[PDB]
């Protein structure tokens, strides 16, 4: 599973940043240490549902003009290989598996079992929220749905559960070959007003903190490290300077490829010899 850190960063940042800027309480919590003036100015400009001004995020070298009132700029940076396993072997799988999904699913009644439906089939069930099925419940997964004994659990006929599971792709089996890569990605906020840049950097730090609970980087992009540069004038040739403070984010991910195996043994030929 080749990793595109930049796209993941963008997808995590955009909705999360919009949600954070949606409400004032979270912003006030974030900007507790800042002075009244800059805090209130940033809140007036960008914060709130009905904010007239808006921030943006995008990759570097855009052929079009880019808004320099407040923008998050991303560039890919360097990368390095840090650790390897014997034969480049990372893991072995019997059934092809895709991404790990989290889905909410209300309990349902079936003639012998309570069940939960899901969007897609199941390759493996990791966890059901606040449940530890015993032998009596006889937890079974049958494609799309997971099921447990009806009678002794009948109080929970409409349990508002949620599920963490894994997609199923194929029944084939193979080996995972790959290594670990230690990658650096640079993120910088741009603004002709330095105070806006400072507040933007603080918001960036908070959303990076919040991201650590995300499933994907919990499973794929562990060992997050941060590093901040100095406030510098990005450009001097305009009528007014652009000010930005670059930040460097580090991640560790496992670049890997699935090598299928067609060998399947189903018969044995134990015979003696004579001389």
């Amino acid at each position: 599973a080749i990793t595109s850190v930049d796209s993941y960063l963008l997808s995590e940042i955009k909705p999360r940043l919009n949600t954070v800027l949606e409400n004032c309480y979270i912003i006030d919590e974030v900007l507790k240490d800042f002075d009244y003036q800059t805090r209130e100015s940033f809140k007036e400009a960008f914060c709130g549902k009905n904010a007239q001004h808006e921030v943006t995020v995008g990759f570097n070298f855009p052929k079009f003009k880019n808004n320099y009132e407040a923008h998050y700029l991303i560039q890919l940076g360097q990368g390095q290989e840090t650790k390897n396993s014997l034969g480049s072997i990372q893991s072995s799988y019997f059934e092809a598996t895709g991404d790990t999904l989290v889905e909410s699913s209300t309990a349902i009644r079936e003639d012998d079992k309570l069940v939960f439906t899901v969007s897609k089939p199941i390759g493996e069930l990791i966890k059901v929220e606040d449940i530890e099925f015993a032998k009596y419940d006889n937890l079974q997964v049958e494609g799309n749905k997971v099921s447990f004994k009806y009678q002794t659990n009948e109080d929970y006929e409409n349990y508002n559960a949620n599920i963490i599971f894994t997609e199923k792709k194929n029944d084939s089996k193979g080996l995972v070959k790959g290594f670990t890569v230690e990658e650096q990605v640079t993120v910088v906020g741009l603004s002709f007003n330095v105070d806006v840049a400072r507040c933007l950097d603080a918001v960036l730090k908070m959303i990076l903190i919040s991201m650590r609970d995300s499933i994907e980087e919990q499973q794929t992009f562990q060992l997050q490290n941060l590093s901040f540069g100095d406030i510098a004038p990005i450009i001097e040739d305009g009528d007014s300077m652009i000010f930005g403070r670059p930040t460097i984010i580090k991640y560790t991910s496992s670049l890997d490829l699935d090598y299928t195996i067609t060998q399947d043994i189903n018969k044995l030929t134990f015979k003696e010899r004579k001389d």
Partner: protein, 48 residues
């Protein structure tokens, strides 16, 4: 009066940017100051 008007374009990682030099000459008795602002309604500029 205005001369040498230039629409100098710099293409960078942040994006494209319009900046250039234009040399002007005033009337008598007028004392301009740093970062004064002028606007020419007559002349229109294309942008995309």
């Amino acid at each position: 009066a205005i001369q040498s008007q230039e629409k100098g374009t710099n293409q960078l990682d942040i994006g494209i940017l319009d900046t250039g030099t234009a040399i002007g000459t005033t009337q008598l008795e007028k004392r301009i100051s740093y970062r004064d602002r002028f606007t020419v309604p007559e002349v229109l500029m294309p942008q995309q």
